[PDB]
Amino acid sequence: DSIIRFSVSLQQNLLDELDNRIIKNGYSSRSELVRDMIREKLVNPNDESKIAVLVVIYDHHQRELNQRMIDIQHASGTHVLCTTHIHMDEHNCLETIILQGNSFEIQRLQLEIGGLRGVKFAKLTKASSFEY
Amino acid sequence: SIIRFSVSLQQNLLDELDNRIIKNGYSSRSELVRDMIREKLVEDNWAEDNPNDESKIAVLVVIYDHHQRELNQRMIDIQHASGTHVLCTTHIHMDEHNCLETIILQGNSFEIQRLQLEIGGLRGVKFAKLTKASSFEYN
Amino acid sequence: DSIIRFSVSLQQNLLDELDNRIIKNGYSSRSELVRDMIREKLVNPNDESKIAVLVVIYDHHQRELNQRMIDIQHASGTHVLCTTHIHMDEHNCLETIILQGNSFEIQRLQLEIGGLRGVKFAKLTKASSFEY
Amino acid sequence: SIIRFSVSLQQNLLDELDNRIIKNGYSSRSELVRDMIREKLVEDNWAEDNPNDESKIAVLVVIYDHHQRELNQRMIDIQHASGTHVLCTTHIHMDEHNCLETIILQGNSFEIQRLQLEIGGLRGVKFAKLTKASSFEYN
């Protein structure tokens, strides 16, 4: 219980926003702000079927991206109930994927989609049935 | 590119963090910290939003009782008074008593947040959660 | 087999387009054009489950319209798989309803939705499973 | 308003028409003739379309094999070359081998029809049907 140093990797876009926030909010380093973000954000996956929504924003000019997300969905074990796509601007589409699955299936789907080249983000909203 | 840098932290905080890597699906501590950072930067961005900005995007996810008469209109009237622009909405019926709706919204951070708050307060609405995006993520 | 006279009622908007088409295409009366339309368009509902899509365009400022369409859907016997709405212009929304049901259920849904005040049209696309 | 007028017809044509009223769900001959008229007026309108017009709306409904690799990209590439604007697309999986997609399109009548024709010719596409609308119906 004592100070440890570890490494973190960010895409330029996130790193750039980080550095602006450090400057805007009066922090003295990346380490200091990230450390504070972790402390703040720190304050059980199971087999039960849950409905979830994954919002993905992606580059609509990235070839085979939709195919790779389909491939990911097909293998995930989740059941896709619906997907909707709209063009949000000149470079990006926004897709919502409404799906059912257990925690492990849905989490893996979100992380695999999120790490695709051309995917700007993939944010999951989960509703377990106690939430309704 | 993608840039690597160091962070310093108490070992017992690092132990609470390392606790959460594998169980949440991550291959490394780095991936999990990245998502905490993304999440917090988007919140900070939405907090400083110009009231003159009307270009924020978000998705509101709502679970509600579709057999509750007048709930649908009350939601429409709230949306019409919010100042936001609905780009697209999707509905699926989970069962005879739950409908899930996704609402794709454009507007000011205030107006969008207000919409979520007002919808979430209605009788028959079980769940109302915003997914926020910030232009630094996709521009 | 001999000539009969019957009556037809159209909303102003359809009647107006009819009269323009009569003039554009060289017809001499409504009766003549409608008679020709019928001849041309003339050239079995069952219990089998079919997937279908209903495209509805409607006035987004008509209060309780969505409620009435929901009421109609709920009573129809059809299972709605998904509905999507977009704003198409300043007065109109476009909704697509993807649904499963038998011929009688889906036909009744289309006709009941189509006759609502504020509904500009409701066009059904049906796929029986021999169509795929 | 809503305006009533008379139509003359041979009795044996009227008998083929009256054959189709109740079975197709109609309460009267008038309702069925109205829908034939709507259908034909929309077709005529789409046939005289200005190649300078890009404001027509239609929905393309497509059933296809979602497990056929590369079909998705081929459809995207066709849509990108069509000249049309996709406003929204929705996909549902009917089973492991059929997906139904609805595509909401804006463009010229030519470009939209061409898109339907090209998509419908692809291996793995089982069904591709346009629902057309004309501004006289909704403006």
The domain that holds A19 is classified in CATH as 1.10.1220.10
**What 3 state SS string does chain C have?**
CCEEEEEEEEEHHHHHHHHHHHHHHCCCCHHHHHHHHHHHHHCCCCCCCEEEEEEEEEECCCCCHHHHHHHHHHHHCCEEEEEEEEECCCCEEEEEEEEEECHHHHHHHHHHHHCCCCEEEEEEEEECCCCC
The answer to whether residues B87 and B39 belong to one domain is: no
- Is A1 part of any domain? no
Q: Is A61 on the interface with B (CB under 8 A)?
A: no
**Residues D69 and D118 both lie in one domain:** yes
Shortest CA distance from A85: residue in chain C = C84
Longest dimension (CA), chain A: 50
Within 79-108 of A, beta carbons closer than 8 Å to B belong to: 81-82, 84, 86, 88, 91-92, 94, 96, 98, 104, 107-108
Of C67, C74, C86, the CB nearest to B88: C86
Look at the block and give the residue holding tokens 């497509």: D62
> Residue C82: its chain A contacts at CB < 8 A?
81-82
Nearest alpha carbon to residue D85 among C21, A115, A93, B17: A93
Furthest-apart CA atoms within chain C: distance in Å? 50
Residue whose tokens read 């697209």:
B88
CA distances from B71 to B53, B99, B122, C60, D99 (A): 30, 12, 8, 16, 32
For residue B23, the enclosing domain spans 11-45
Does D139 map to a domain?
A: yes
Number of domains in chain B: 2
A51 touches A130 (CB < 8 A): no
Instruction: Quote the CA–CA distance of A47 and B100 in Å, as a whole number.
Output: 21
Q: Please tell me whether residues B92 and B117 are part of one structural domain.
A: yes
Select from A18, C23, C124, D6 the least CA-distant residue to B3. Answer: A18
Is residue C4 domain-resident?
no
Shared domain check, D124 and D58: yes
Sign of CA dihedral C20, C22, C28, C32: negative
Q: Which of A59, A69, A70 to mutate to test the interface with D (most CBs of D within 10 A)?
A: A70
- Determine, yes or no, domain membership for D2: no
Cα separation, D127 vs C112, in Å, equals: 26
Nearest residue, CB atoms, B90 vs list C70, C84, C87? C84
Annotated binding site of B: 80, 91, 93, 99
A32 shares its domain with A84:
no
Same domain, A38 and A53: no
The sign of the dihedral angle between the CA atoms of B25, B31, B36, B39 is: negative
Residue B70 lies in a domain: yes
Q: Are residues C37 and C52 in the same domain?
A: no
Gyration radius of chain A's alpha carbons = 18
CB contact under 8 A, C41 and D40: yes
- CA B73, CA C114: separation in Å to the nearest integer? 20
- Give B94→chain C minimum CA distance, Å: 10
CA gap D82, D95 in Å, rounded: 29
For residue B116, is it within any domain? yes
* Residues C79 and C119 both lie in one domain: yes
- Whole-number Å distance between alpha carbons of B119 and B116: 5
At C27, list the tokens. Answer: 């017809």
Q: Which residue of C has its CA nearest to A96?
A: C84
Give yes or no: residues B65 and B121 share one domain. Answer: yes
Other CB atoms closer than 10 Å to residue B52's CB: what's the count? 6
Same domain as B65, residue B25: no
Are A22 and A86 part of one and the same domain?
no
Is D88 a known ligand-binding residue?
A: no
Instruction: Report d(CA A118, CA B114) in Å as an integer.
Output: 32
The structure tokens 């009256």 sit at D18
Chosen from B62, B67, B76, B85 to mutate, greatest number of chain C CBs within 10 A: B76
For residue A108, tell me if it sits in a domain. Answer: yes
Cβ contact C120:C91 at 8 Å: no
Please report, in range form, the residues annotated as the binding site of B for Ni(2+). 80, 91, 93, 99
CATH, residue D115? 3.30.70.1150
Same domain, A50 and A74: yes
d(CA B23, CA B20): 6
Identify the helix (H) or strand (E) that includes residue B91.
strand B85-93
Q: From the CB of residue D77, how many other CB atoms can be counted at a distance below 10 Å? A: 12
Angstrom distance (rounded) from CA C16 to CA C33: 13
Taking contacts as CB-CB distances below 8 angstroms, the residues of chain C near D86 are: none
The two tokens of residue C18 are 């009819």
Q: In chain A, which residues are followed by a C-to-N distance beyond 2.5 Å, i.e. a gap?
A: 43
